[PDB]
Amino acid sequence: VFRQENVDDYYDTGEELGSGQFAVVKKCREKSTGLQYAAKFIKKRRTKSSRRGVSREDIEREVSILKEIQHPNVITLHEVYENKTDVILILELVAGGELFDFLAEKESLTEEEATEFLKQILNGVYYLHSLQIAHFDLKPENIMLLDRNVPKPRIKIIDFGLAHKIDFGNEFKNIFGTPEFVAPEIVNYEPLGLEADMWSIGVITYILLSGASPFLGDTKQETLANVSAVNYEFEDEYFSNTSALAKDFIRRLLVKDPKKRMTIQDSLQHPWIKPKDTQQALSRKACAVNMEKFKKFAAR
Numbered sequence: 001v002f003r004q005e006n007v008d009d010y011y012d013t014g015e016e017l018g019s020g021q022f023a024v025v026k027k028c029r030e031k032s033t034g035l036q037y038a039a040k041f042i043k044k045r046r047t048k049s050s051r052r053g054v055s056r057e058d059i060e061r062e063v064s065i066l067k068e069i070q071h072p073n074v075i076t077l078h079e080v081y082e083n084k085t086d087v088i089l090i091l092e093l094v095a096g097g098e099l100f101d102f103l104a105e106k107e108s109l110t111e112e113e114a115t116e117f118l119k120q121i122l123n124g125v126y127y128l129h130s131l132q133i134a135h136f137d138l139k140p141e142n143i144m145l146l147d148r149n150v151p152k153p154r155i156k157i158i159d160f161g162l163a164h165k166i167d168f169g170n171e172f173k174n175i176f177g178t179p180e181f182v183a184p185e186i187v188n189y190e191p192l193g194l195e196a197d198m199w200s201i202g203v204i205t206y207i208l209l210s211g212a213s214p215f216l217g218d219t220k221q222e223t224l225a226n227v228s229a230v231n232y233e234f235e236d237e238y239f240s241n242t243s244a245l246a247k248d249f250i251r252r253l254l255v256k257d258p259k260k261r262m263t264i265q266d267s268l269q270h271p272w273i274k275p276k277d278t279q280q281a282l283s284r285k286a287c288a289v290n291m292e293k294f295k296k297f298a299a300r
Contacts, residue, residue, distance in 0.1 A: 096145025202253025
């Protein structure tokens, strides 16, 4: 359950790291160990008729998922408190900022170097998917770095707000997420599973290489329609110096039919991620990220 004590008895809290919807995040320090965490205050709705907070079901689900996950590439949950108005998640402090903002600062980035970071996301998803957990909100802002000032920065996937344990024997259908990142089955209210994360990874990879967004249109409805139609191009302006292997990887991910979409286990075996001969390995070193445009992307 959730500790019914004053978190202020156990933590010192300070600067605001962020906020959104019905939550604020503060940096905090555990008094008994002196260790630093993130404290996330989530407003309870309190009455069902209220649209001014988060329902207990949703908090319960997220927390229950967070309780299970123990993997270097996903945030860890330390503790959970509850008071009259909030549930308070004490979360592993993830301070490296957004992966993309960190990549937007290099001068150059080989596909080989790109796959270094991308493989870290795959490993994180491999684990979640191995536990039957769909994240359902994979997008660039949810790919953080634990610490930016080390030679080999580690990726942490965060924000399990939309995540679900997949239930054999009960279809799950819903609309949610960010239009340019959601799979067609989310747009069309079709059944949802692990496969929807694989679509989103395709989108991320496409942006990582190009600085361009695959399905983004001039309006929400246009973006939704591009997605449902799988209407995307490898526009020559953006994919000039991008290998076939990289393009094959994305093509096997951006696939309307979930049953034909590449799986996490397969993507880890794909030649672009795991070169199976010397030609492919060199192709990876040779081609690069469209970094001029990519930087423009990180502009937001």
